């Protein structure tokens, strides 16, 4: 493995639970808070209850989803079953600081019969070829907002 | 190791396999191709080498020495000549010992060359295709206007 | 210098310089064909890391209004990548260079 | 002596044969018969793409 | 590549131009089609050289010329067998082509 | 002219920014492009820079 992997790219299966950052304004302060509105949940802020009910019929923009750290893109695959050159994630690798690894790639040695020092027909890696071609993005998935952040994750203000 | 300019002392270069030994002849070179890697973004290529540049004789870590092994066997050569090209000259961002960073152009092969005691050359196959800074394939910024985060090999010895 | 008897060519001396104390880096092709029991390990130096460098790229679009309108005028210095996208409308995504003023509405 | 890049990676199918074609520098590559009515056709490799 | 004194240096070139037969160094020999060269081999008057693709040729020298000549010349890609992008270092199959040897005739 | 020297002379060199330093962000270059000219069908390159040759 490069040194690329120290870096980009990992893939997930979201399922997003939902959390907002609501302001409360009772006219004497200006507050914001961060509060899961999934399940019922009690906080008195300025000794003014507040329960958040339940948020229901909320879009989700992640599925299927690659994160690279260029730029987040919608992609779909099928894990540890990628190998070759024909493909970009040619290796497969179950963890971060793995030490296995699902590809197939194929490079021939052949027998030294010359006055020269092996014979190789190489084909090399599909990867590098299939950094430019890229996906299409998920930041732009979204019928209103979402705004998706790479580092921890996320998607802001999706209304 | 646990110490650079040990590991140094303790890898002497070595002659390898060239085919091209001023193009006119294949033999033993001094200098060969180990292994190019790159994935930088900002167009880095990091080269391993057969020699040994920056690294001295006398099994010391100097400047000014390069120390070469080839079928004349482990001479030292000043450092006035070194170049790195895929078909025209690269700029060379630092050299040590078999490591060599160069920020090169494009092109289908990779070439190291010097032409001052060794004065031969090797080249092999290597694909350098753009990958360079920001959005544009384009090198070469105007001036400052927004920094963008990049990937780079780094001058520094680990 | 040794002289052994009862002799013809060919393999029966097959002569070959070797060095002792040196070691090698995997390779696609170089000689490597001794092998032996002294061995080594060596740090691998020049990191990928992250670093920051400083870029400008030309002017970013001329907005024009209108009623319900929004008009844009593309102006480059050299070619300069720009992406039509939409997000507060149904996805689209499409990348073209322009190298050349052209207005989009 | 140079290298001449290796045969393309296969997949078989009832009775035909399709070849995936890395991306690798640009090769000739000549498509033909010769046992059936003649036809040749000469295309540049330089992309991936299957062919049956 | 030839010394005036009957003697081969590869080192010297010899010109007789304004100021008589005179010597002049062959590192300072530059050729550019649009980029460098590697002089193969030099008998005479023809010099063997290995260069790249060029719309033109430039000769030039400035040990004591510092001057030069360049002629339109049609030197377009032509690299050996049907797949482009040479690779002598290997081997996998040995292919006919043409060339001009290094023997002295 | 006769006094062409004494006005480069004046007119001394300082350093300043050129956004590629190497790259890994812009610096102070003894050597900085101040605009390179190009209109000649020929090549040639009217090139300023802030040193004097």
Known sequence: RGESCEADAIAYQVTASLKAQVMISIGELNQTVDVFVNGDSPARIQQSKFILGPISSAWSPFDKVIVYRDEVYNEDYAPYGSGQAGRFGDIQSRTVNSTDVYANTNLKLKRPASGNVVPYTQTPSGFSYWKKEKGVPLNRNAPFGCIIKVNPVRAENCV | ?158 | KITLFNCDTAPKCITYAVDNTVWQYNSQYVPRSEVTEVKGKIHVPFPLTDSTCAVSVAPEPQVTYRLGEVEFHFHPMYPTLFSIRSLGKDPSHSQEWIDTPMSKT
């Open chain 2, 1 to 158: 190791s646990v110490a650079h300019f040990e590991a140094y002392k303790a890898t002497r270069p070595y002659i390898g396999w060239c085919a091209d030994c001023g193009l006119a002849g294949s033999c033993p070179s001094p200098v060969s191709i180990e292994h190019v890697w790159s994935d930088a973004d900002d167009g880095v290529l990091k080269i391993q080498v057969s020699m040994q540049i920056g690294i001295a004789k006398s099994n010391t870590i100097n400047h000014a020495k390069i120390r070469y092994m080839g079928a004349n066997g482990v001479q030292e050569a000043e450092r006035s000549t070194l170049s790195v090209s895929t078909t025209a000259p690269c700029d060379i961002l630092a050299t040590m010992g078999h490591f060599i960073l160069a920020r090169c152009r494009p092109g289908s092969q990779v070439e190291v060359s010097l032409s001052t005691d060794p004065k031969l050359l090797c080249r092999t196959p290597f694909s350098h295709k753009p990958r360079f800074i920001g959005n544009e394939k384009s090198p070469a910024p105007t001036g400052h206007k927004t920094r963008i985060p990049c990937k780079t090999y780094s001058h520094q010895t680990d």
